[PDB]
RNA sequence: CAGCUUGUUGGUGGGGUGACGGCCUACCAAGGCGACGACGGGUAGCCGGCCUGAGAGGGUGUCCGGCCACACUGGGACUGA
RNA sequence: AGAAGCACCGGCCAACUACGUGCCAGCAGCCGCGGUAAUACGUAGGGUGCGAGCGUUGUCCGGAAUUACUGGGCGUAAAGAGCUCGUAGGUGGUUUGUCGCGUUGUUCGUGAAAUCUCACGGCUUAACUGUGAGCGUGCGGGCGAUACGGGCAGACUAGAGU
RNA sequence: CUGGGCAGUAACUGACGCUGAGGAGCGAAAGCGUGGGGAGCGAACAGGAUUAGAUACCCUGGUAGUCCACGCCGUAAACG
RNA sequence: UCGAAGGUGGGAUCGGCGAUUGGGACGAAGUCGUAACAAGGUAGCCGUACCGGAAGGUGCGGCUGGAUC
């Protein structure tokens, strides 16, 4: 509207918020994974989600999510972290890759056999 | 300016996006061997070698003198 | 009172919507030429110029089909004073995919899309009459 | 020997004294697949009665569409109460490109080459109403020739 | 890659047999799976996907090759589906199938891949080759008098010959007069749904 | 980020350059730039190109090609077309 | 005879049964499933799609007409400054003449190559590559027009003011 | 003492018009500074009453304020 | 003469930590009240001032986005 006013003040695209701040440019960031514990998700879920405090090589501390049936995690551990939303936990915005430098692939895994870590057979 | 004059020039260029025609005014420094020019005093200018640090124009003739 | 072409188009559109059989407005050469183009295109009936109290007034009579049907589907000014619209021969505007007529102001005078494309000279698209 | 497709099905609720009352409304589009298209809203307690009423209303509200050889003549831009859908003629090679409701209405009408997009609300009923409105403002070159005169100031390279 | 799997299972899934031959029918209805005898709501995307898969498994075309064929067809002027079908037909296996030098498309692909055809007296081993106008196709001289060819040498007179191709007698030579017209020869499938599928 | 500039703007006479030129020098005037954004802060090699988008547009400058800038950091001269 | 695997199967979107489990184990892009008959969890079978590749992550474009020239709105959903004056700026009544700056036409030069497209030619085909033409939206120069905007020179009263 | 508007004649000039970034002026009530004034009302405050409580609604009182002079403040559901 | 580096000095600008302290968002099934939605029990809002554990109350002026004869 008002081409003269548009000439005086052009349009501006919406502001953007980045979603990979902790990784800051890396699809996977190598972390430390200290103090593995378990918390409770939001009200209408009533579960016990296994989480951890992992500090990346980019020197940021975030709370990640551990997928699969159980884990071998412990105090500081040689782990890889990828992005992902949990939709139940307050502010967990990253997920640890299962089948990485330290953590093992989820045993007894036969379906989808790539996520959570699973060799075919050998 | 002691043998120099300052001349306002204007031009129109179409907007790259909106397409409206707009007018922009510029400013050039013109050499005046005999400094005879006042406020207004329309002048046609032809561009020369770098006569000075900021002078690239010279006086050609005086047309439509100031009212 | 800006863009008398737009005022003329708006008056014609309002009269056509209100089923008016007669319009009146002050006369200008541009409006007379536009009336000539409209008469040639067949969207309107006869037009004439009559001398009012001041200046001249241009008079356009409209046409209606068999029922209360309007030959003029609509009007749309194109080259507004806020942003002028210029078109060349290779990219002349199309109205209704050829079923509409756009007035083109070229060095040959006021011309329609097809006639202007025939002679290959473009200009300012005044409006779409379709 | 008609072609029918349902666009939207949903259940409405009205509060009564003792509890809840439900009903079903199912808009159904009916046509023969060549040039005829019908619109029926329909409403009943059960889905079969609802779609039957929609089919009947479409049969009642059948209306003529102008075609020029499988595609529309000139681009149109209709507008419903809230739906905003525009239709444009396309090359014969191109199929029918539209959303759910628009594509259903167009395929019941019998259009083979059309470019349709929705720009207003995403409600199925309003999209249908906008599409059928655009079909209504669609005119015929012969009709505009009757309106003006000299049926030569038109382009129909496909002809036939 | 190649399917190398049960063609009849694909035919039962697609609800339309498209291979024929000796194993045309299974003498049973089409419940392709455990729940295949149950009725399923027909979605708009389902019809287009089924049509595309029918064409791909009829012509032995991988997904990327079919994508390239469709994009070339739409980029070509005029129509899109007809051009796509013409490109699909222009394959060596399809040409051999139409000229009746093989039992089905899979047999034609097997022979052309094993390299028993010299088009202009030149060895080829790719079914992806496309024929053109004024192009000859000939049988390898050494490969004559072999069983897979002599089995059909005398019983190749059952299937019809398309109006664009022609066959030669005791010594078979395949020549291409012009581009095919699948719209008038052997079109068991409508391409106007594939053209809508590929524009999503 | 609302006031920026003093060889800074111009002129004169010399010097200097392959070459015009405050490029340098001695003297004279008070001028020059700024809301069409100077000055200041953040970021960045530019383009032909690449991706997406029907298009307009949005993102990007990696293969390759053209140019520019740099050679541990900072500064300088010479040889030589 | 020496050679296939991969992901998904609640709506978006193509793909359902059973077993164990019973807000626990768990999955998940949303909203939603799991608290004792789970097509949504792990598993088995079955199906779908692709394929020596299939899924996840990272970022950009599109859907988004949710920065709208194309292509948005501002009574009540977000949106008219509390009002007025006025600087720059944008915009402007009728008519005559001149210029031809904007406008537009032709011509010439330029707009490197590859790469984008048409048409062909060669690697058994394709990828890859060669050729002819488009592209290079533009710019500079000459030669045509004043229909509209505009510069100048005038005129009129309707606008406006007295 | 002074502003504006409307009507009439067309008497006069002759596009001198519209909007207006910034900028400037005006701008309810409440409030602030200086001096004056203060009948009535009336925040704050006090007593009584209601209530489990009543820092309120009700009653009895009562200070600034409401008023004037010159300044300041420039805010309202300043809304059609 | 100029001239890199270095020293001395007052400033300019951008960050990190900080005893202590203010407000905000979310949590559970806590404590104290019922301010709004009905005339919500004293109609509700808007600007300001004052007061009180808290929501809030009172005064001044305005609106109906309430009613009344
Ligand atoms: Mg707009
Ligand atoms: Mg000099
Ligand atoms: Mg919408
Ligand atoms: Mg491959
Ligand atoms: Mg000096
Ligand atoms: Mg000097
Ligand atoms: Mg850099
Ligand atoms: Mg778009
Ligand atoms: Mg360096
Ligand atoms: Mg080094
Ligand atoms: Mg160095
Ligand atoms: Mg040398
Ligand atoms: Mg030398
Ligand atoms: Mg499905
Ligand atoms: Mg169970
Ligand atoms: Mg499952
Ligand atoms: Mg997106
Ligand atoms: Mg967009
Ligand atoms: Mg909107
Ligand atoms: Mg509201
Ligand atoms: Mg609002
Ligand atoms: Mg106002
Ligand atoms: Mg306001
Ligand atoms: Mg306000
Ligand atoms: Mg002004
Ligand atoms: Mg003006
Ligand atoms: Mg004018
Ligand atoms: Mg003007
Ligand atoms: Mg070749
Ligand atoms: Mg080129
Ligand atoms: Mg030229
Ligand atoms: Mg008057
Ligand atoms: Mg006069
Ligand atoms: Mg004004
Ligand atoms: Mg202002
Ligand atoms: Mg007061
Ligand atoms: Mg006072
Ligand atoms: Mg006092
Ligand atoms: Mg008390
Ligand atoms: Mg009292
Ligand atoms: Mg009292
Ligand atoms: Mg006080
Ligand atoms: Mg004041
Ligand atoms: Mg008021
Ligand atoms: Mg602290
Ligand atoms: Mg209450
Ligand atoms: Mg209250
Ligand atoms: Mg009460
Ligand atoms: Mg109350
Ligand atoms: Mg009180
Ligand atoms: Mg108050
Ligand atoms: Mg009150």
Automatic annotation (TrEMBL), chain A:
GO cellular component: small ribosomal subunit
Name under which the protein is recorded: Small ribosomal subunit protein uS12
Record has Ribonucleoprotein as a keyword: yes
NCBIfam families: rpsL_bact
Chain intervals for the UniProt region annotation (Disordered): 104-122
Composition skew (Basic residues), residue ranges: 107-117
Organism: Mycobacterium tuberculosis
UniProt GO MF annotations: rRNA binding; structural constituent of ribosome; tRNA binding
Assembly behavior: Part of the 30S ribosomal subunit. Contacts proteins S8 and S17. May interact with IF1 in the 30S initiation complex.
Lyase among keywords: no
UniProtKB/TrEMBL annotation, chain B:
Name used for this protein in its record: Small ribosomal subunit protein uS17
Family according to the record: Belongs to the universal ribosomal protein uS17 family.
Quaternary state and interactors: Part of the 30S ribosomal subunit.
Role description: One of the primary rRNA binding proteins, it binds specifically to the 5'-end of 16S ribosomal RNA.
Native source species: Mycobacterium tuberculosis
Superkingdom, taxonomy of origin: Bacteria
TrEMBL record, chain C:
GO cellular component: cytoplasm; ribonucleoprotein complex; ribosome
GO biological process: translation
Source taxon at top rank: Bacteria
InterPro entries (UniProt xref): Ribosomal_uS8, Ribosomal_uS8_CS, Ribosomal_uS8_sf
One Gene Ontology term of the molecular function aspect: structural constituent of ribosome
Transmembrane feature ranges: none
Pfam families (alphabetical): Ribosomal_S8
Keyword entries, A-Z: Ribonucleoprotein, Ribosomal protein, RNA-binding, rRNA-binding
Keyword Cytoplasm: no
Functional note: One of the primary rRNA binding proteins, it binds directly to 16S rRNA central domain where it helps coordinate assembly of the platform of the 30S subunit.
Family: Belongs to the universal ribosomal protein uS8 family.
Assembly, per entry: Part of the 30S ribosomal subunit. Contacts proteins S5 and S12.
HAMAP family attached to this UniProt entry: Ribosomal_uS8_B
The protein's name: Small ribosomal subunit protein uS8
TrEMBL record, chain D:
The keyword Ribosomal protein appears for this protein: yes
Keyword terms of this UniProt record: Ribonucleoprotein, Ribosomal protein, RNA-binding, rRNA-binding
UniProt entry tagged with the keyword Hydrolase: no
Membrane-spanning intervals of the chain: none
Ranges of residues in domain S5 DRBM: 2-65
Signal peptide start-end: none
GO-annotated cellular components: cytoplasm; small ribosomal subunit
Gene Ontology biological process terms in this record: ribosome biogenesis; translation
GO terms of molecular function: rRNA binding; structural constituent of ribosome
Functional description taken from the UniProt entry: With S4 and S12 plays an important role in translational accuracy.
Complex formation: Part of the 30S ribosomal subunit. Contacts proteins S4 and S8.
Membership in a protein family: Belongs to the universal ribosomal protein uS5 family.
UniProt remark on domains: The N-terminal domain interacts with the head of the 30S subunit; the C-terminal domain interacts with the body and contacts protein S4. The interaction surface between S4 and S5 is involved in control of translational fidelity.
Protein name as annotated: Small ribosomal subunit protein uS5
Species the sequence originates in: Mycobacterium tuberculosis
Gene that specifies this protein: rpsE
Whole-protein residues included: 41 to 200 of 220
